[PDB]
Amino acid sequence: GSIGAASMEFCFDVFKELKVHHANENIFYCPIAIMSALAMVYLGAKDSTRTQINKVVRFDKLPGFGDSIEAQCGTSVNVHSSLRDILNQITKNDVYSFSLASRLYAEERYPILPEYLQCVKELYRGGLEPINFQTAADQARELINSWVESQTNGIIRNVLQPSSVDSQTAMVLVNAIVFKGLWEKTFKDEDTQAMPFRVTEQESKPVQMMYQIGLFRVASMASEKMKILELPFASGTMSMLVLLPDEVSGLEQLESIINFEKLTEWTSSNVMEERKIKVYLPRMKMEEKYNLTSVLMAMGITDVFSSSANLSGISSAESLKISQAVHAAHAEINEAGTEVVGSAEAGVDAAEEFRADHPFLFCIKHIATNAVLFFGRCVSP
C-alpha cells in the first residue's frame, strides 16, 4: 500500500522473530537500513530467489516490469524508487540531521554486471570500492570495518568479525546510518533525578529519570491496559511513540497483539488527544548487534542463502549467494533529544501522568509517511 505500511509490517515481523531469541533483553534496530540493504540484493536476484524476498518484505509493488536492471531502474513505480524517495525526504537540517551512506566493496575485476553497479550508484547512491578479497581478505575486512567506524564516529566497531569474509567473497554490501534529532519540547537537566526502574514485578534498579510537564498527545487503551505517548522532534516531520503497559509486567502481553493494524488503530485521531501531563522518561543508552541470517531465514527467505540461489543479476560469471548478514545499532536518548548510529551489512560469496519506570516499547516514525525508522524494547535503561 506504500513504503510506510511496508516498513511497518516488516518491522513487526522482524520483532516477532527477535524477541524469541532475546527475551528479557533490550532490543533495538533500524528497519529502514535493513530494507535498504535487502533492496540492493533484491535488485540482482531472479526467479524464486527474487520472488521469495518480495513475498516477505512486501516492498515491490506488483506487477513487475521485468527483472532487467534497466527495467527496475527505469520503471518509476517500484521498490527502488519508493525506497529512494523516502530516503531523499528524510535526508537533512538545523535542528535534526539524518544520513544513510551505502557502499559496495567488490573483488579486483570480478564479473559484476556493469548495469548493476550503474543503478546501485544511481538509485541507492552507492560508491563502488575495489577491494582485494582473493589474496588479502584480511586487509579488506579491516578496511571495511574502518569505514563503518568512521561513519559512526567510532561508535560501531568491527562490524565484521574475523573470517566473515575470505578468498571466496565476491562482494560486501554495507550501509551506515546516522540520526541526530532535537526534541521539540526538551527536558531540563535540573529536573533529572535518580529513580527506581522496576524491571521485574519484583526487582528494581536506579536510573536517571528525565522529567517535564507540558502539552502532549496521549491515548488511553483501558481495555488493553496501556497508554501511548507521542514526543515530537523539533523538525515537525518525526516523532517518537512510546507504548507503556499499565502493569509492571504487562509487556509480555502487549508484544503478542501488536502489529501495523493495532498501531495504526491506536495512533488514530479519535484515540489520541492533546492533554497537559507529567512525563517521566529515563535516559537510555542501547547497543545491540544481530545476525540477520537466522532472522531472515526464519521469516521465510531461504534461497538467497542456499546453493540454489539466483543472483545472476549481479554476475552471470559465477554462482553466488549471501554468506552472512549483520546489523549493529546504537541509540542514546537524553534531555536534548536522541542520537542513533547503525549499520546493515551482507556478504556475497561464490556459491495526567505518564511515568515510564517499567519496560516499554518505542519507535521513531516519519509523520507524513508513517515510515518506521527505529524500533526498540527498553527493559534496562
Side-chain angles (χ1 to χ4, degrees), residues 116-129:
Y116 179 72
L117 300 182
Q118 240 65 50
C119 180
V120 156
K121 168 186 175 178
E122 240 60 285
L123 281 163
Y124 292 105
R125 310 196 176 193
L128 176 284
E129 304 293 316

Side-chain angles (χ1 to χ4, degrees), residues 21 31 50 62 68 87 92 97 99 103 123 129 139 154 164 188-189 207 240 243 246 268 279 297 303 322 333-334 362:
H21 300 287
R50 184 192 171 82
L62 307 183
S68 176
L87 288 180
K92 280 186 53 171
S97 73
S99 52
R103 260 198 174 184
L123 281 163
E129 304 293 316
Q139 191 175 184
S164 63
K188 300 198 199 77
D189 242 1
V207 298
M240 169 171 80
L243 301 69
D246 285 308
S268 182
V279 177
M297 222 165 267
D303 301 319
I322 297 181
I333 297 179
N334 59 48
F362 70 100

Side-chain angles (χ1 to χ4, degrees), residues 105-107 110 131-134 137 164-172 320 323-324 346-350:
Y105 287 86
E107 174 63 44
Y110 185 83
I131 204 65
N132 171 44
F133 282 124
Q134 266 285 308
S164 63
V165 290
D166 43 48
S167 61
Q168 319 302 290
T169 304
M171 174 181 68
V172 165
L320 305 172
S323 187
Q324 95 283 162
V348 187
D349 289 29

